[PDB]
């Protein structure tokens, strides 16, 4: 009665937001430092968990 359970999980990589979902919640958040690139605007090549 100490058993096992298998579960497959799924993660997307490099996928891409639909046209409507590319907004930001507010004008300033996750803002880059003043003269910087804003890496949040390029396509995601990574995934975190």
């Amino acid at each position: 009665l100490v058993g096992a359970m298998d579960l497959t999980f799924v993660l997307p990589l490099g996928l891409f937001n639909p046209a409507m979902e590319r907004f930001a919640a507010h004008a300033g958040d996750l803002v880059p430092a003043p003269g910087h690139p804003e890496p949040r605007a390029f396509p995601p090549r990574q995934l975190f968990f």
Binding site: V10, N17, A41, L47
Partner: protein
């Protein structure tokens, strides 16, 4: 093997989206520009591990 399915895990393409994820899915950032978060739908949701 029955349901023919695989479950999402909480994962973000950003560290700062993933930081929103902790504390549950209320205020989690589900998209920021091209970055996306996916919260946990899985038999393990609501558990600790």
């Amino acid at each position: 093997g029955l349901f023919q399915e695989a479950y999402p895990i909480t994962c973000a393409s950003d560290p700062a989206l993933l930081r929103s994820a902790r504390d549950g899915e209320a205020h989690a950032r589900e998209t920021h520009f091209t970055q996306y978060l996916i919260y946990d739908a899985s038999p393990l949701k609501g558990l600790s591990l």
